[PDB]
PDB file of all heavy atoms in Angstrom:
ATOM      1  N   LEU D1020      10.172   9.598 -24.160  1.00  2.00           N
ATOM      2  CA  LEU D1020      11.009  10.329 -23.188  1.00  2.00           C
ATOM      3  C   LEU D1020      10.923  11.884 -23.343  1.00  2.00           C
ATOM      4  O   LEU D1020      10.805  12.575 -22.313  1.00  2.00           O
ATOM      5  CB  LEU D1020      12.536   9.934 -23.356  1.00  2.00           C
ATOM      6  CG  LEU D1020      13.457  10.627 -22.442  1.00  2.00           C
ATOM      7  CD1 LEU D1020      13.189  10.478 -20.995  1.00  2.00           C
ATOM      8  CD2 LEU D1020      15.000  10.266 -22.733  1.00  2.00           C
ATOM      9  N   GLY D1021      10.972  12.277 -24.551  1.00  2.00           N
ATOM     10  CA  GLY D1021      10.979  13.710 -24.866  1.00  2.00           C
ATOM     11  C   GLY D1021       9.697  14.349 -24.434  1.00  2.00           C
ATOM     12  O   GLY D1021       9.752  15.501 -23.866  1.00  2.00           O
ATOM     13  N   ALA D1022       8.495  13.706 -24.621  1.00  2.00           N
ATOM     14  CA  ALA D1022       7.257  14.285 -24.250  1.00  2.00           C
ATOM     15  C   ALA D1022       7.152  14.210 -22.756  1.00  2.00           C
ATOM     16  O   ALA D1022       6.513  15.084 -22.176  1.00  2.00           O
ATOM     17  CB  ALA D1022       6.165  13.473 -24.899  1.00  2.00           C
ATOM     18  N   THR D1023       7.638  13.184 -22.091  1.00  2.00           N
ATOM     19  CA  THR D1023       7.534  12.991 -20.630  1.00  2.00           C
ATOM     20  C   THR D1023       8.316  14.119 -20.008  1.00  2.00           C
ATOM     21  O   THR D1023       7.849  14.816 -19.009  1.00  2.00           O
ATOM     22  CB  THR D1023       8.096  11.639 -20.192  1.00  2.00           C
ATOM     23  OG1 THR D1023       7.283  10.559 -20.804  1.00  2.00           O
ATOM     24  CG2 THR D1023       7.910  11.396 -18.635  1.00  2.00           C
ATOM     25  N   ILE D1024       9.524  14.413 -20.402  1.00  2.00           N
ATOM     26  CA  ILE D1024      10.336  15.397 -19.797  1.00  2.00           C
ATOM     27  C   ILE D1024       9.709  16.809 -20.059  1.00  2.00           C
ATOM     28  O   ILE D1024       9.727  17.697 -19.156  1.00  2.00           O
ATOM     29  CB  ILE D1024      11.810  15.373 -20.349  1.00  2.00           C
ATOM     30  CG1 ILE D1024      12.473  14.057 -19.970  1.00  2.00           C
ATOM     31  CG2 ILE D1024      12.576  16.559 -20.002  1.00  2.00           C
ATOM     32  CD1 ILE D1024      12.423  13.845 -18.425  1.00  2.00           C
ATOM     33  N   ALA D1025       9.059  17.041 -21.221  1.00  2.00           N
ATOM     34  CA  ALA D1025       8.582  18.386 -21.509  1.00  2.00           C
ATOM     35  C   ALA D1025       7.391  18.559 -20.610  1.00  2.00           C
ATOM     36  O   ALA D1025       7.116  19.672 -20.075  1.00  2.00           O
ATOM     37  CB  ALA D1025       8.113  18.457 -22.958  1.00  2.00           C
ATOM     38  N   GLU D1026       6.597  17.492 -20.329  1.00  2.00           N
ATOM     39  CA  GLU D1026       5.418  17.561 -19.456  1.00  2.00           C
ATOM     40  C   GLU D1026       5.861  17.917 -17.997  1.00  2.00           C
ATOM     41  O   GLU D1026       5.356  18.824 -17.390  1.00  2.00           O
ATOM     42  CB  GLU D1026       4.739  16.270 -19.460  1.00  2.00           C
ATOM     43  CG  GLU D1026       3.573  16.184 -18.471  1.00  2.00           C
ATOM     44  CD  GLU D1026       2.815  14.820 -18.529  1.00  2.00           C
ATOM     45  OE1 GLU D1026       2.765  14.170 -19.661  1.00  2.00           O
ATOM     46  OE2 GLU D1026       2.350  14.444 -17.436  1.00  2.00           O
ATOM     47  N   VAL D1027       6.848  17.144 -17.477  1.00  2.00           N
ATOM     48  CA  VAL D1027       7.339  17.425 -16.163  1.00  2.00           C
ATOM     49  C   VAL D1027       7.889  18.810 -16.048  1.00  2.00           C
ATOM     50  O   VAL D1027       7.732  19.542 -15.057  1.00  2.00           O
ATOM     51  CB  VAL D1027       8.339  16.356 -15.731  1.00  2.00           C
ATOM     52  CG1 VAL D1027       8.934  16.653 -14.365  1.00  2.00           C
ATOM     53  CG2 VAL D1027       7.765  15.039 -15.730  1.00  2.00           C
ATOM     54  N   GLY D1028       8.690  19.184 -17.094  1.00  2.00           N
ATOM     55  CA  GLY D1028       9.205  20.505 -17.129  1.00  2.00           C
ATOM     56  C   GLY D1028       8.238  21.640 -17.120  1.00  2.00           C
ATOM     57  O   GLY D1028       8.588  22.767 -16.610  1.00  2.00           O
ATOM     58  N   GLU D1029       7.053  21.425 -17.576  1.00  2.00           N
ATOM     59  CA  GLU D1029       6.004  22.419 -17.538  1.00  2.00           C
ATOM     60  C   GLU D1029       5.289  22.392 -16.224  1.00  2.00           C
ATOM     61  O   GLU D1029       4.856  23.573 -15.695  1.00  2.00           O
ATOM     62  CB  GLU D1029       4.973  22.078 -18.659  1.00  2.00           C
ATOM     63  CG  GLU D1029       4.020  23.301 -18.924  1.00  2.00           C
ATOM     64  CD  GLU D1029       2.963  22.918 -19.934  1.00  2.00           C
ATOM     65  OE1 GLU D1029       3.187  22.073 -20.705  1.00  2.00           O
ATOM     66  OE2 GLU D1029       1.890  23.622 -19.959  1.00  2.00           O
ATOM     67  N   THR D1049      18.308  13.470 -22.538  1.00  2.00           N
ATOM     68  CA  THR D1049      17.680  14.811 -22.574  1.00  2.00           C
ATOM     69  C   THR D1049      18.652  15.763 -21.932  1.00  2.00           C
ATOM     70  O   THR D1049      19.225  15.552 -20.876  1.00  2.00           O
ATOM     71  CB  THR D1049      16.341  14.849 -21.982  1.00  2.00           C
ATOM     72  OG1 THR D1049      16.376  14.415 -20.674  1.00  2.00           O
ATOM     73  CG2 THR D1049      15.335  14.089 -22.817  1.00  2.00           C
ATOM     74  N   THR D1050      18.710  17.008 -22.493  1.00  2.00           N
ATOM     75  CA  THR D1050      19.293  18.218 -21.847  1.00  2.00           C
ATOM     76  C   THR D1050      18.099  19.053 -21.367  1.00  2.00           C
ATOM     77  O   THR D1050      17.189  19.292 -22.135  1.00  2.00           O
ATOM     78  CB  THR D1050      20.225  18.928 -22.729  1.00  2.00           C
ATOM     79  OG1 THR D1050      19.535  19.246 -23.982  1.00  2.00           O
ATOM     80  CG2 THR D1050      21.444  18.072 -22.964  1.00  2.00           C
ATOM     81  N   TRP D1051      18.072  19.374 -20.122  1.00  2.00           N
ATOM     82  CA  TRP D1051      17.022  20.164 -19.539  1.00  2.00           C
ATOM     83  C   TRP D1051      17.565  20.874 -18.293  1.00  2.00           C
ATOM     84  O   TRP D1051      17.156  20.437 -17.153  1.00  2.00           O
ATOM     85  CB  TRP D1051      15.719  19.386 -19.227  1.00  2.00           C
ATOM     86  CG  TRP D1051      14.496  20.229 -18.982  1.00  2.00           C
ATOM     87  CD1 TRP D1051      14.156  20.882 -17.880  1.00  2.00           C
ATOM     88  CD2 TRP D1051      13.489  20.448 -20.006  1.00  2.00           C
ATOM     89  NE1 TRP D1051      12.975  21.575 -18.116  1.00  2.00           N
ATOM     90  CE2 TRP D1051      12.528  21.249 -19.304  1.00  2.00           C
ATOM     91  CE3 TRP D1051      13.231  20.013 -21.307  1.00  2.00           C
ATOM     92  CZ2 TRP D1051      11.398  21.679 -20.040  1.00  2.00           C
ATOM     93  CZ3 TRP D1051      12.114  20.464 -21.975  1.00  2.00           C
ATOM     94  CH2 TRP D1051      11.151  21.236 -21.235  1.00  2.00           C
ATOM     95  N   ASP D1082      20.969  22.925 -24.576  1.00  2.00           N
ATOM     96  CA  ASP D1082      19.831  22.658 -23.646  1.00  2.00           C
ATOM     97  C   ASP D1082      18.559  22.417 -24.428  1.00  2.00           C
ATOM     98  O   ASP D1082      18.367  22.807 -25.554  1.00  2.00           O
ATOM     99  CB  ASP D1082      19.711  23.898 -22.673  1.00  2.00           C
ATOM    100  CG  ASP D1082      18.804  23.451 -21.563  1.00  2.00           C
ATOM    101  OD1 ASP D1082      18.644  22.354 -21.188  1.00  2.00           O
ATOM    102  OD2 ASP D1082      18.261  24.517 -20.962  1.00  2.00           O
ATOM    103  N   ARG D1083      17.595  21.732 -23.701  1.00  2.00           N
ATOM    104  CA  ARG D1083      16.314  21.431 -24.204  1.00  2.00           C
ATOM    105  C   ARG D1083      16.336  20.630 -25.549  1.00  2.00           C
ATOM    106  O   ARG D1083      15.644  20.946 -26.473  1.00  2.00           O
ATOM    107  CB  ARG D1083      15.581  22.719 -24.476  1.00  2.00           C
ATOM    108  CG  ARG D1083      15.367  23.596 -23.203  1.00  2.00           C
ATOM    109  CD  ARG D1083      14.479  22.900 -22.214  1.00  2.00           C
ATOM    110  NE  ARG D1083      14.294  23.791 -21.075  1.00  2.00           N
ATOM    111  CZ  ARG D1083      13.061  24.467 -20.860  1.00  2.00           C
ATOM    112  NH1 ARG D1083      12.136  24.488 -21.798  1.00  2.00           N
ATOM    113  NH2 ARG D1083      13.005  25.203 -19.725  1.00  2.00           N
ATOM    114  N   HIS D1084      17.115  19.585 -25.575  1.00  2.00           N
ATOM    115  CA  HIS D1084      17.205  18.633 -26.706  1.00  2.00           C
ATOM    116  C   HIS D1084      17.118  17.221 -26.314  1.00  2.00           C
ATOM    117  O   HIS D1084      17.502  16.924 -25.134  1.00  2.00           O
ATOM    118  CB  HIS D1084      18.416  18.952 -27.572  1.00  2.00           C
ATOM    119  CG  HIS D1084      18.402  20.060 -28.483  1.00  2.00           C
ATOM    120  ND1 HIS D1084      18.482  21.413 -27.982  1.00  2.00           N
ATOM    121  CD2 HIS D1084      18.239  20.164 -29.776  1.00  2.00           C
ATOM    122  CE1 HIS D1084      18.371  22.176 -29.055  1.00  2.00           C
ATOM    123  NE2 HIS D1084      18.167  21.434 -30.121  1.00  2.00           N
ATOM    124  N   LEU D1085      16.725  16.375 -27.283  1.00  2.00           N
ATOM    125  CA  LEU D1085      16.712  14.926 -27.104  1.00  2.00           C
ATOM    126  C   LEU D1085      18.015  14.408 -27.968  1.00  2.00           C
ATOM    127  O   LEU D1085      18.120  14.964 -29.110  1.00  2.00           O
ATOM    128  CB  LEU D1085      15.481  14.337 -27.528  1.00  2.00           C
ATOM    129  CG  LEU D1085      15.388  12.747 -27.505  1.00  2.00           C
ATOM    130  CD1 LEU D1085      15.162  12.268 -26.035  1.00  2.00           C
ATOM    131  CD2 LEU D1085      14.255  12.250 -28.430  1.00  2.00           C
ATOM    132  N   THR D1096      17.425  16.219 -31.571  1.00  2.00           N
ATOM    133  CA  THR D1096      16.167  16.861 -31.854  1.00  2.00           C
ATOM    134  C   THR D1096      15.788  17.834 -30.780  1.00  2.00           C
ATOM    135  O   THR D1096      16.107  17.589 -29.665  1.00  2.00           O
ATOM    136  CB  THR D1096      15.066  15.870 -32.099  1.00  2.00           C
ATOM    137  OG1 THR D1096      14.917  15.009 -30.939  1.00  2.00           O
ATOM    138  CG2 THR D1096      15.272  14.938 -33.344  1.00  2.00           C
ATOM    139  N   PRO D1097      15.093  18.916 -31.129  1.00  2.00           N
ATOM    140  CA  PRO D1097      14.573  19.829 -30.034  1.00  2.00           C
ATOM    141  C   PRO D1097      13.522  19.088 -29.152  1.00  2.00           C
ATOM    142  O   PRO D1097      13.042  18.164 -29.582  1.00  2.00           O
ATOM    143  CB  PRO D1097      13.948  20.954 -30.768  1.00  2.00           C
ATOM    144  CG  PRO D1097      14.122  20.717 -32.210  1.00  2.00           C
ATOM    145  CD  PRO D1097      14.511  19.237 -32.396  1.00  2.00           C
ATOM    146  N   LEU D1098      13.314  19.636 -27.957  1.00  2.00           N
ATOM    147  CA  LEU D1098      12.145  19.195 -27.125  1.00  2.00           C
ATOM    148  C   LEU D1098      11.110  20.345 -27.245  1.00  2.00           C
ATOM    149  O   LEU D1098      11.446  21.494 -27.556  1.00  2.00           O
ATOM    150  CB  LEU D1098      12.571  18.962 -25.671  1.00  2.00           C
ATOM    151  CG  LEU D1098      13.576  17.838 -25.458  1.00  2.00           C
ATOM    152  CD1 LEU D1098      14.161  17.928 -24.058  1.00  2.00           C
ATOM    153  CD2 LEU D1098      12.821  16.509 -25.704  1.00  2.00           C
ATOM    154  N   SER D1099       9.912  20.013 -26.921  1.00  2.00           N
ATOM    155  CA  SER D1099       8.791  21.001 -27.029  1.00  2.00           C
ATOM    156  C   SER D1099       8.904  21.976 -25.840  1.00  2.00           C
ATOM    157  O   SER D1099       9.261  21.659 -24.744  1.00  2.00           O
ATOM    158  CB  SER D1099       7.389  20.255 -26.919  1.00  2.00           C
ATOM    159  OG  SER D1099       6.408  21.164 -26.803  1.00  2.00           O
ATOM    160  N   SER D1100       8.738  23.224 -26.218  1.00  2.00           N
ATOM    161  CA  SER D1100       8.776  24.330 -25.252  1.00  2.00           C
ATOM    162  C   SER D1100       7.452  24.789 -24.719  1.00  2.00           C
ATOM    163  O   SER D1100       6.389  24.259 -25.144  1.00  2.00           O
ATOM    164  CB  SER D1100       9.478  25.574 -25.922  1.00  2.00           C
ATOM    165  N   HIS D1101       7.393  25.727 -23.803  1.00  2.00           N
ATOM    166  CA  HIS D1101       6.248  26.182 -23.104  1.00  2.00           C
ATOM    167  C   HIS D1101       5.094  26.585 -23.994  1.00  2.00           C
ATOM    168  O   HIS D1101       4.019  26.809 -23.611  1.00  2.00           O
ATOM    169  CB  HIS D1101       6.569  27.343 -22.127  1.00  2.00           C
TER     170      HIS D1101
END
Side-chain angles (χ1 to χ4, degrees), chain D residues 1020-1029 1049-1051 1082-1085 1096-1099:
Chain D
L1020 175 63
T1023 301
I1024 292 307
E1026 175 178 329
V1027 175
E1029 193 183 340
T1049 54
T1050 51
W1051 196 282
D1082 193 24
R1083 302 294 184 98
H1084 281 76
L1085 178 79
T1096 56
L1098 296 167
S1099 174

